[PDB]
């Protein structure tokens, strides 16, 4: 519709034909922050912009009242904004207060033009349709979503738009009921940002192993959520690592070598900076395969390196001075062990990179260090404020980890990420042992109270750490019902909970269509009928804080909702 | 032997003046930065011996005793070729080592560790003299005054039981006036 | 001072700012089309990516504006925020 | 109104600004040469002809902060000076080990040069860009053991050293200064 | 020693800076009111550079 | 025995590695990468003001192409099947399969601005309009090699049975010509070591490259690394090839001698006088995918006699004379070229006459160089068949002053009488 996959050059030709000048800045990139894709993405673009001489601007932005705020203070010489990994599933022009009117130019003829562009660069679906259909001044990046499947809605919005009797209105009835059957889908993400944006660097020509990095990176971001977003999107990833390597074979190792490969990565939590025996142990997956969580679980792991012939001791050797003869052997030591543990998807090839002689670093790796960063890396509403100015600052830490001259704050990351696991795993084995989760009927209800780390859940990415965590250990079991997950966490000092509206996944071998997120218009729901002081302003509109008093009203309505 | 011990050395040589970080040569310039100042030793991380070369580092922790002796060699020589002009002298190079290999408690190091290379920790007890180890023997046999030289390196040495071409049973004693020594010192860590 | 006072005497005091006085004369004068006050470290790029380091709202320039929001970061020609990088509230290069 | 450490020295970063100045030779990957069947650059420092006069690939001349500027972004590529190569450079390697006393003629800017091309260029170099830093590294060692060999020989008169660099200059200057200076203030002291 | 200034050569010089930075003006004015902006950044960073130079020369004396 | 194999302008093998060039010229590059079962294929441009680089997952396989400014054509030998893409792209592309008998193939492809050409191994000659429509079918010798520049085609022939031939157009939107019709070339095809066995098996013909100068000269680099232009192309019976620049004997020139070898010249474009070219090392004879920088060679006439640099050099110093004949005839070739581009076409920058004048400036001053060694000698004829040849009136007046300063008084009489004539 908007810019479809076939023509997001045209899009980025008016925004050098409109927003480009030696003079004057003129561009403006609104980032979501705690998003790896759309960090990720907003790098590709500050390095085409860069190259092309761009004059412009990088807003980090926590949500959707900072959105507010931050557009309401651009002036009029600020003639596009570029919004980065958000806005898609919202009424933008309704939500600024556009009107077309205020922003029309130079009309003349049957024609429009406008004294500001907003481009939209979202994953996030379902669209809304005001902005893919209802706005002329919302620009919309799709993947082709919209020619794919909504010709239906596109019908039924325009038609209910021209229907200002019998038929009149058995027909405006049934094009509400279309549009309130598309809306109230639940939340789901369908591409990565990164590789839009790649896509249209592809377009340009503009592809370089630097970009194509970034990409792998920002893809790579979604495979604990999402992994069928990155099935779909892992072999074109590969054909442009093979597009954009040099020819040369047998090649020797050397200071200016940056070599990116297709290899086995395997599902191990940081493997070549954790030990072989920490990356099988802090892993989401193994933990919930191997039941990892307790005692019983612990044996088996030890078990298993004991079948391997792996000695403990060499396990748990720091994965560089670990045992050279076991680094080469250790596929054949996986393929020849882990089926029998039922671990055999720990085998996987993904994209390792490496420069020079520092070593080896994966796509898994390195965003892990780089969510660690985005998490930690640095009178209630004040409060508040200053904490999410401790996000939107942790923005850049992650952002200057992406550049080579800087490994060493990309080391910082992967010590981060490190600690941050464990006190994902210890949190996670208290919930587990003392059996938090309750098993409300229709979800389950995880609420903590008090302990530990407690402080640190307040970030929503180390939240969906914990929530990804438990999720994975429910999917590996037969045993339990898929049902979606509600996981929250109270601020002592700011005496909300934090809580966030989780999907469930199938186990993460196993191949079907995607379950998608409806805690985002069922907490709209709540919120509506409710006088509860709630928050729903995060970009991540399945996260939401409340005050404590309100939390067991609210649940007690979410619960006898029918919308879940 | 001293083919592959040829071989090994010159690893090393290229592992000083090839080994390159953000456009610093950074053993070259630490050996020459030492070279200045006299004191004739490298300090080398291993994270970057790894990086470089994994076959030298498994050389190297396969057995230490008579790898570390080549690597100073390859030091010497590098030292050479880096502040003497070729064709128009220096001691054996200590090479120091920095590691972040997983420490081993005193208490539990045993005879799985005899030869490895080992990291660990605790406090110094006691600190005793200076005492003085050959790094180069002259000798010379009693009886027909054969003269040769035994070069010493100091990881686990004698001299010969009888001579080189009667000289008697037990032949040899040292010249300690061509002969050179070192420091040696002794530590009690607790 | 020509782009702690406890510490000096009344005729350092005087002294100093007569010796303001000067260099904004100077630079004034003739020879304006130079800011003589500026930096003596030699142009090496012409475009630079600046991080807004403390918060000063929209400032016009030449041609344009800046809104100068904390943790925002621009890529921007230097010659036009010089005065803020020495003035302390831009960070990078 | 000059800082302490300007007084009497250029900074590293004015050295380079100094090399920037001199022509080099450049691939352009644009065309400004308008034909028979817009801005033109218009400078005042240095010659306007070669860049309005610019066809891809045809090699041009011009001077070397233009050059990054363009090679800066993909519109150019810089043609490496001849002794920047491998066998030239090993050839004045073997020129420094062969004469002692002398150094090799090697132009002023090199080590500068040598810098910023493998900085900025680092994709343009014919020959493989880690050997080249190799030999550059070789022949500062060597060069610098022979200004170490110089220095036993500081005088109140005068002294020659006749193919270092600029960098190299500006690295010894504010010690052989002084010293010279100071032997100088000893020597004519002693003078009745 | 404090070297003789160059007096006629600094009059063409600032003379030469003045009526270029008018030209830099009169083109982005016709900018504002073909379109490649490469020699433009080459004018401004070349003033930038020679201003940087005076600037240098008279600091020092 | 002789196959016929598919060819494109400069383009390599793949050898023993995943990924090949399909053709490099003055406008850019085109390389393909065994991505598995299908081909990865990147359009690379060195004009990046005009052109943007672009790529495209390719199921068909094609091996060959011709890349020119308005568009890239490609086409698959084996099954037909060619595409032309404009560069544009407001212009739509268009795919289409021309018919092969069993055992026919593509031998190479070219574009136009209003024509699209294949040519094929049983010597079927397909013309196409720029947007696919068929326009004729003629029949000739099997076309081995074929390039275009504007609307000047020009092709080489070859069979067992006709020999090495070439053909020369000028297709154009209006008064369509043909100047020559498979004329005998003059090119040394390879012996029909093991590197150069699997360059031939890909290349039999042995031609590296085949293109037009800037000035619309047909060129032509054959086995013996020389480069060949067709001079005074466009009167027929005058026509004649020059063989410009011998790269073999300029690489041992530059060198320094030594029988050097395992260096390679890999040609893109003559531009006016000056060979763009990467410079390859080792075993192999071509290019990697990281594309050096087209290094410039000089044309150089081959009068350079190697036995006398030998003697002389035993870093190369040339002798005074022999630098003067190079001179003289690159200078009296390169002006004649010039003025015959200057007369048909015209000027197509501002400079060209500016260009023809110093160019002549530095013909007589050859002339005078060897005409002092010829009075150095006291040969009188010699020096006098020599003041014959200079062009400038007031260059002739320096024959005088060298005759004078030969005490050479014949010469001097002779030489004004030359004087009074080109006067009069
Ligand atoms: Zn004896």
Redesign the pocket.
Known sequence: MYYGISQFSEAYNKILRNSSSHSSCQLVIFVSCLNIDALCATKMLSLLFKKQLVQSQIVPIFGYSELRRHYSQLDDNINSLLLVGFGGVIDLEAFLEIDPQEYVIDTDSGEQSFRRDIYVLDAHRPWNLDNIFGSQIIQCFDDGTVDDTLGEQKEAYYKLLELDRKQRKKQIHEYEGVLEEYYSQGTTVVNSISAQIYSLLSAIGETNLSNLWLNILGTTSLDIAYAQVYNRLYPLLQDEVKRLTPSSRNSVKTPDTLTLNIQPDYYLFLLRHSSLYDSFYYSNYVNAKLSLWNENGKKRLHKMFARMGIPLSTAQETWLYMDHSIKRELGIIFDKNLDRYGLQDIIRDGFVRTLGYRGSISASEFVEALTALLEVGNNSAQKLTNLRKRWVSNFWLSWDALDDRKVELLNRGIQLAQDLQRAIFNTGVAILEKKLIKHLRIYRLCVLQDGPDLDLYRNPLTLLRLGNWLIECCAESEDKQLLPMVLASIDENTDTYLVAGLTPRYPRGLDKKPILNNFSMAFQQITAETDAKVRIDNFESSIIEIRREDLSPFLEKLTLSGLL | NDDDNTEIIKSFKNFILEFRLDSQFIYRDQLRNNILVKNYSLTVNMEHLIGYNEDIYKKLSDEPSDIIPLFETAITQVAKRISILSRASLPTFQLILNSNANQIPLRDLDSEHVSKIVRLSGIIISTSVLSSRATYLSIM??????TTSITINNFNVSLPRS???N?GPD?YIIIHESSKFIDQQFLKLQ | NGLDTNNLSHQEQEYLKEYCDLITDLKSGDLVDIDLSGSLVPPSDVFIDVRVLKDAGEIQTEYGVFNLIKDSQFFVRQSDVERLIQQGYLQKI | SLPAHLQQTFSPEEIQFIVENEPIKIFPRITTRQKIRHTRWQLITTDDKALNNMVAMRSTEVVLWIALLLKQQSKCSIVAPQWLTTKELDRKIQYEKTHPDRFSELPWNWLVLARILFNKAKDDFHDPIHELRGKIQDLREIRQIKVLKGLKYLNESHLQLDNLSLLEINELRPFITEIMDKLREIHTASLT | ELLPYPHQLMKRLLNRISMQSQLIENISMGFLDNESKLPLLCMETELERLKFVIRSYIRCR | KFRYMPFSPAGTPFGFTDRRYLTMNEVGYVSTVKNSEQYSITVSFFDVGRFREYHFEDLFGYDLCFLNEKGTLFGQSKTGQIQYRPHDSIHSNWTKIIPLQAGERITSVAATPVRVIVGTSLGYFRSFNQFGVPFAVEKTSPIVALTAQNYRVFSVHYSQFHGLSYSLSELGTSSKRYYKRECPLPMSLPNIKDANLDYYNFNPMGIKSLFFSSYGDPCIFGSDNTLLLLSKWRSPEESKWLPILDSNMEIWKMSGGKETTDIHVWPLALAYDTLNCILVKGKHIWPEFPLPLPSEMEIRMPVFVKSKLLEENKEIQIPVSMAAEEEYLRSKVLSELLTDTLENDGEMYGNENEVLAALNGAYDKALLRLFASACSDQNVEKALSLAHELKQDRALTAAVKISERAELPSLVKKINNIREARYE
Do not use: F, I, T, V
């Open positions: 046999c009693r009886n027909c005054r054969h001579c080189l071409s000289c032949p």
